[PDB]
Design a protein around this ligand. Sequence first.
Ligand SMILES: Nc1nc2c(ncn2[C@@H]2O[C@H](COP(=O)(O)OP(=O)(O)O)[C@@H](O)[C@H]2O)c(=O)[nH]1
Ligand SMILES: Nc1nc2c(ncn2[C@@H]2O[C@H](COP(=O)(O)OP(=O)(O)O)[C@@H](O)[C@H]2O)c(=O)[nH]1
Ligand SMILES: [Mg+2]
Ligand SMILES: [Mg+2]
Ligand SMILES: [Mg+2]
Lengths: 170, 171
Amino acid sequence: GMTEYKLVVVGAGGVGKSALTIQLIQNHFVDEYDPTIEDSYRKQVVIDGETCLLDILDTAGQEEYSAMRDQYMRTGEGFLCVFAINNSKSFADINLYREQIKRVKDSDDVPMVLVGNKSDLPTRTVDTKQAHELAKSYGIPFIETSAKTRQGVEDAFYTLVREIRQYRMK
Amino acid sequence: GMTEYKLVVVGAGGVGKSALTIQLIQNHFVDEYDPTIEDSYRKQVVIDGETCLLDILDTAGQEEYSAMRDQYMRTGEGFLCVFAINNSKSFADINLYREQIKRVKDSDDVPMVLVGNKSDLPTRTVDTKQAHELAKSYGIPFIETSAKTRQGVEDAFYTLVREIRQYRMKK
Ligand SMILES: Nc1nc2c(ncn2[C@@H]2O[C@H](COP(=O)(O)OP(=O)(O)O)[C@@H](O)[C@H]2O)c(=O)[nH]1
Ligand SMILES: Nc1nc2c(ncn2[C@@H]2O[C@H](COP(=O)(O)OP(=O)(O)O)[C@@H](O)[C@H]2O)c(=O)[nH]1
Ligand SMILES: [Mg+2]
Ligand SMILES: [Mg+2]
Ligand SMILES: [Mg+2]
């Protein structure tokens, strides 16, 4: 068969979790997408010559209980912590999502990537230096993305897979 | 005699560790204070009817080794983990400081309080809900402070003393 990589996309509402996931899977930018819908996506891809399966959960952060969500949070191999560069509250939210991940995984060290989405916008409230500093303090990579222009979308998910690969080394 | 509560004030540079400590000890707000200076302060206070002595170290987070810092870190009874409400990087820094305290104390459970300083400022990057959520996940109290207005200053140090008191109660 093929190696599976279970990825979970987390972050504040409206950062672009769905738009980044739909861009990667379906090669389309959603101008509007139901903020309450939480779906899983499977995509066969080639990363550094490895034919592999991506099993991605696009979380919605809803109160409603979900057996599938519980599974992905506990068995998730890598997490994409997404914030919007024009939403300071979402950047501050990252540390909560990291604490939530640490809780659901029962681990201080989880493969994860910091994603600074909406890089296409000319007005920023979170600069690249602030974002790099946060990622450096966690010891994780930082990828600037735009679901609209496709900039860094593939890079964000592939770098996360590369982070999981690093943990699988011994 | 007077019981001695050894407190250590930690957090990112520029959050207001020195300004909170100088406000509590000297009743003055510093607009600027040497970021490299690390000093200890002793103050006699009455907390819930207990006349006691506060032995506070205002850390500077310098790489330079300090014998005094090492002793306050290892023997410190309670820690004030300070962030600035207009500095998101400092809020994210809290987990590193909490991990540093855990390492030097060689304990998963250390009395500590989360301090959200600069409450006087009208522009925030870290809201009260986010701060309460972080403190809830650690299981420690959260106190909003302002070294400028004196709001929550006494409350932050007194709550920390109350946290040490809780740990000193028979299991
Ligand atoms: N300009 C811009 N808008 C984006 C980008 N990503 C998402 N959006 C928009 O932001 C809104 C929220 O996106 P959505 O994917 O639903 O966010 P979610 O709640 O995190 O899943 C939508 O109107 C998207 O079209 C981006 O990179 N640039
Ligand atoms: N507005 C405001 N400024 C503060 C407050 N506390 C500290 N500052 C300012 O923040 C800067 C850094 O404070 P300082 O105590 O030196 O930070 P430290 O490096 O953590 O010790 C100085 O300009 C202080 O006057 C506060 O409560 N409100
Ligand atoms: Mg969504
Ligand atoms: Mg899209
Ligand atoms: Mg200082």
